[PDB]
Amino acid sequence: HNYKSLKYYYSKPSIELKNLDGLYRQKVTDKGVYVWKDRKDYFVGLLGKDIEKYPQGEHDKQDAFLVIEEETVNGRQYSIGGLSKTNSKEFSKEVDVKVTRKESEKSKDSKFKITKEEISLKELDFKLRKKLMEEEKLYGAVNNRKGKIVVKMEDDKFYTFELTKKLQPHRMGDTIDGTKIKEINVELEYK
Amino acid sequence: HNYKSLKYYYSKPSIELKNLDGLYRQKVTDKGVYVWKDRKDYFVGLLGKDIEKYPQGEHDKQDAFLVIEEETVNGRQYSIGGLSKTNSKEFSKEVDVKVTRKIDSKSKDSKFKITKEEISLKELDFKLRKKLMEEEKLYGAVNNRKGKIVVKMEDDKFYTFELTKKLQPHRMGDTIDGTKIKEINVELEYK
Numbered sequence: 149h150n151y152k153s154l155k156y157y158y159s160k161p162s163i164e165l166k167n168l169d170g171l172y173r174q175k176v177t178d179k180g181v182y183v184w185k186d187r188k189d190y191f192v193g194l195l196g197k198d199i200e201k202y203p204q205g206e207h208d209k210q211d212a213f214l215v216i217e218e219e220t221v222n223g224r225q226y227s228i229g230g231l232s233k234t235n236s237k238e239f240s241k242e243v244d245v246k247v248t249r250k251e252s253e254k255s256k257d258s259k260f261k262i263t264k265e266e267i268s269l270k271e272l273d274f275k276l277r278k279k280l281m282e283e284e285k286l287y288g289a290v291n292n293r294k295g296k297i298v299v300k301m302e303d304d305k306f307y308t309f310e311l312t313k314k315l316q317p318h319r320m321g322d323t324i325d326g327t328k329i330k331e332i333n334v335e336l337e338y339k
Numbered sequence: 340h341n342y343k344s345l346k347y348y349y350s351k352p353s354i355e356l357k358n359l360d361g362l363y364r365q366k367v368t369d370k371g372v373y374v375w376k377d378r379k380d381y382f383v384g385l386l387g388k389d390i391e392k393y394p395q396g397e398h399d400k401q402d403a404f405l406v407i408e409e410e411t412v413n414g415r416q417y418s419i420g421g422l423s424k425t426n427s428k429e430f431s432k433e434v435d436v437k438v439t440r441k442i443d444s445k446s447k448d449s450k451f452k453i454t455k456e457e458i459s460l461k462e463l464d465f466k467l468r469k470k471l472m473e474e475e476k477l478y479g480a481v482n483n484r485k486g487k488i489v490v491k492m493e494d495d496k497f498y499t500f501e502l503t504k505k506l507q508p509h510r511m512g513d514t515i516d517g518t519k520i521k522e523i524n525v526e527l528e529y530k
């Protein structure tokens with residue numbers, strides 16, 4: 149997996165658009181939706197099961213976590229997945245992030261703030277990799293790239309992000325219940 | 340999986356470009372290449388392992404199997420995957436296609452001509468589904484969408500296309516040795 153392209157994606161700035169002014173699926177044959185907030189618009193690709201969530205028409209109170217791609221699509225700035233339902237109320241939750249270095253092994257523990265009731269895997273993946281780039285030298289060297297991030301739910305279900313490669317596009321639009329995240333366990337296979 | 344978008348895709352015309360005048364990967368951060376032949380140009384997305392075949396710069400001796408997408412990308416007509424090495428010899432082979440109707444039903448056999456030494460899964464998938472629409476009422480209506488196409492190779496390796504949904508984008512750029520295809524087996528679970 150191209151290391152230039154990997155760190156380049158995770159080093160990019162993100163745009164958190166809460167409560168979009170609009171989200172429009174022009175037609176079911178389109179593989180995306182036009183979103184806009186505060187006189188700025190974007191086209192957001194629907195490349196996974198997220199496509200089933202936005203039938204033709206307008207949809208209110210959606211959120212978008214954007215990471216702007218290199219490609220312009222339908223004449224607009226483009227991002228893939230990262231859509232979710234806006235919050236119903238003010239919300240913030242603090243979960244444990246436990247980072248383990250592995251062969252071998254005590255974890256380095258910190259806290260991570262969850263403010264969305266419904267959150268895309270794009271957002272969690274992006275923010276958690278930033279944290280690891282800032283705090284654990286992830287992608288700080290060509291050898292600092294192997295491991296996994298595991299988001300564990302209160303019911304013990306889990307979602308895994310493999311660090312040697314980018315999150316797969318068809319998973320960027322998957323969402324989970326942020327109010328039900330129990331903890332985040334990280335394995336780093338490099339020192 | 341949306342039936343409308345499924346059928347819309349396989350009903351489309353294809354454009355087969357043999358020996359491109361150019362194929363240009365502008366930069367390693369891009370997710371595609373610019374291709375052109377004669378005076379027509381397109382942008383082709385590299386969304387699977389195909390991305391590793393085209394580093395920055397030009398690449399000669401390539402073919403493109405295009406199916407134009409709804410989205411314009413980089414101000415151009417767009418297609419996903421479908422790239423391959425052009426033939427070095429005038430290779431042609433007639434492969435058996437065996438259609439079995441799996442309703443708990445001898446196979447109905449015909450021939451399918453391969454003219455490329457290396458062929459994208461996008462091209463085989465697309466042509467084989469046209470044949471099945473033309474001859475076996477695939478996507479003729481609702482309930483005419485279940486089954487699979489299996490491309491079998493000389494060493495018993497195989498490649499499968501599930502008919503109930505579109506070929507996955509990350510597989511459109513995968514290529515196989517057309518000279519080693521042994522047969523094509525189709526199981527239709529409808530009538």
Ligand SMILES: CC(=O)N[C@@H]1[C@@H](O)[C@H](O[C@@H]2O[C@H](CO)[C@H](O)[C@H](O[C@]3(C(=O)O)C[C@H](O)[C@@H](NC(C)=O)[C@H]([C@H](O)[C@H](O)CO)O3)[C@H]2O)[C@@H](CO)O[C@H]1O
Pocket residue numbers: 269305306307308309310316319322509
């Ligand atoms: C080459 C390539 O990228 N191929 C992918 C393949 O990786 C991918 O499978 C998924 O791979 C990820 C790691 O990259 C996980 O292993 C997925 O399993 C899990 C997960 O741990 O995340 C299992 C887990 O039990 C699931 N949780 C629930 C509640 O069901 C999650 C969940 O379904 C996903 O995280 C949601 O995005 O998946 C594993 O599926 C496949 C499928 O994406 O696609 C290939 O192209």
Ligand SMILES: CC(=O)N[C@@H]1[C@@H](O)[C@H](O[C@@H]2O[C@H](CO)[C@H](O)[C@H](O[C@]3(C(=O)O)C[C@H](O)[C@@H](NC(C)=O)[C@H]([C@H](O)[C@H](O)CO)O3)[C@H]2O)[C@@H](CO)O[C@H]1O
Pocket residue numbers: 318460496497498499500501507509510513
């Ligand atoms: C929901 C979703 O789309 N998930 C996909 C998941 O389906 C996909 O897995 C592939 O699924 C296809 C059928 O759709 C096949 O079953 C793949 O298995 C095979 C195949 O039969 O095609 C197995 C076979 O042994 C392999 N042949 C060789 C020589 O290795 C092939 C081959 O690797 C592929 O055909 C090449 O594209 O695969 C199965 O992998 C996964 C991975 O694409 O992605 C999820 O997102």
